[PDB]
């Protein structure tokens, strides 16, 4: 997280030089992905379905859509609603976003199927009485 | 010489990987072709003992995860693991003519844990499916 902070902020002020608000389609979307697909979060990866998967989070994610006002960070996690990109300018909009956030996350947040934290949550169900159990 | 008309389970098998090489290596041989210049097609049948050209082999016991395969077109499931009855592995001369923009390639890991490819499948997704939503739920095919 941190290589790739510095990595936006190298690039972002290579790009805007100094300047107030730089256009969208300016951004170097290219130079970001890229070295996070083969450098930060890249140079753990040793399988190519993995470093595929890597890489369509990241052409998902960081393009001129996402400044969009109806960008969609995620799409149908209960079947009809989902997760909006908030519309914020400054971070502490952001913040605001995040912390009013639901306490209803499923595994459809992060693209996968709603049934992959059954047989999780399941065992630690079990594993919750177990520990009951043995400290009664 | 039968060998090649037998059923074969991957799973079972000790070494998965070599059968999917040997396969690869037996039609190159009488085309006179090389590995490389042959792409593996996948045609899942719905039951087991049908035709099996001179060209295909076919597969038993491989389980797709997270989809569900109906005439040759997956779509995304929310079952775990759906069993495919019989799968033919065709070898055919490549035609390098790139993706056709609803085809999803799918890893063939060896068991659950996923550690161990042993070898790719192309599917042609069906409806409206995106092709990356099938990268991002994981979906794969098992070989026991």
Same mark, same amino acid.
């Given at each position: 997280?941190?290589?790739?902070?510095?990595?936006?902020?190298?690039?972002? #002020? #290579?790009?805007?030089?100094?300047?107030?608000?730089?256009?969208?389609?300016?951004?170097?979307?290219?130079?970001?992905?890229?070295?996070?697909?083969?450098?930060?979060?890249?140079?753990?990866?040793?399988? +190519?379905? #993995?470093?595929?998967?890597?890489?369509?989070?990241?052409?998902?994610?960081?393009?001129?859509?996402?400044?969009?006002? +109806?960008?969609?960070?995620?799409?149908?996690?209960?079947?009809?609603?989902?997760?909006?990109?908030?519309?914020?300018?400054?971070?502490?909009?952001?913040?605001?976003?995040?912390?009013?956030?639901? #306490?209803?996350?499923?595994?459809?947040?992060?693209?996968?199927?709603?049934?992959?934290?059954?047989?999780?949550?399941?065992?630690?169900?079990?594993?919750?009485?177990?520990?009951?159990?043995?400290?009664? | 010489?039968?060998?090649?008309?037998?059923?074969?389970?991957?799973?079972?098998?000790?070494?998965?990987?070599?059968?999917?090489?040997?396969?690869?290596?037996?039609?190159?041989?009488?085309?006179?072709?090389?590995?490389?210049?042959?792409?593996?097609?996948?045609?899942?049948?719905?039951?087991?003992?049908?035709?099996? %050209?001179?060209?295909?082999?076919?597969?038993?016991?491989?389980?797709?995860?997270?989809?569900?395969?109906?005439?040759?077109?997956?779509?995304?499931?929310?079952?775990?693991?759906?069993?495919?009855?019989?799968?033919?592995?065709?070898?055919?001369?490549?035609?390098?003519?790139?993706?056709?923009?609803?085809?999803?390639?799918?890893?063939?890991?060896?068991?659950?844990?996923?550690? %161990?490819?042993?070898?790719?499948? %192309?599917?042609?997704?069906?409806?409206?499916? %995106?092709?990356?939503?099938?990268?991002?739920?994981?979906?794969?095919?098992?070989?026991?």
């Amino acid at each position: 997280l941190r290589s790739a902070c510095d990595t936006v902020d190298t690039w972002l #002020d #290579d790009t805007a030089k100094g300047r107030q608000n730089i256009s969208p389609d300016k951004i170097p979307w290219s130079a970001l992905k890229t070295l996070m697909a083969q450098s930060i979060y890249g140079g753990r990866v040793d399988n +190519e379905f #993995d470093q595929r998967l890597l890489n369509t989070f990241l052409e998902r994610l960081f393009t001129t859509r996402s400044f969009d006002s +109806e960008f969609k960070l995620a799409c149908k996690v209960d079947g009809h609603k989902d997760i909006q990109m908030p519309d914020g300018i400054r971070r502490e909009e952001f913040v605001q976003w995040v912390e009013l956030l639901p #306490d209803t996350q499923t595994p459809s947040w992060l693209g996968l199927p709603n049934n992959a934290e059954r047989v999780l949550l399941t065992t630690q169900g079990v594993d919750m009485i177990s520990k009951m159990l043995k400290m009664q | 010489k039968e060998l090649k008309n037998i059923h074969v389970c991957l799973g079972g098998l000790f070494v998965p990987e070599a059968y999917i090489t040997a396969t690869r290596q037996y039609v190159a041989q009488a085309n006179s072709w090389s590995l490389e210049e042959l792409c593996l097609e996948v045609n899942v049948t719905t039951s087991q003992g049908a035709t099996l %050209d001179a060209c295909s082999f076919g597969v038993t016991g491989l389980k797709l995860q997270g989809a569900t395969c109906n005439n040759n077109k997956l779509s995304l499931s929310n079952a775990i693991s759906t069993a495919l009855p019989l799968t033919q592995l065709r070898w055919v001369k490549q035609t390098n003519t790139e993706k056709k923009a609803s085809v999803v390639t799918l890893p063939v890991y060896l068991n659950f844990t996923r550690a %161990d490819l042993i070898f790719t499948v %192309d599917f042609e997704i069906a409806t409206k499916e %995106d092709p990356r939503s099938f990268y991002e739920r994981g979906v794969a095919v098992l070989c026991t």
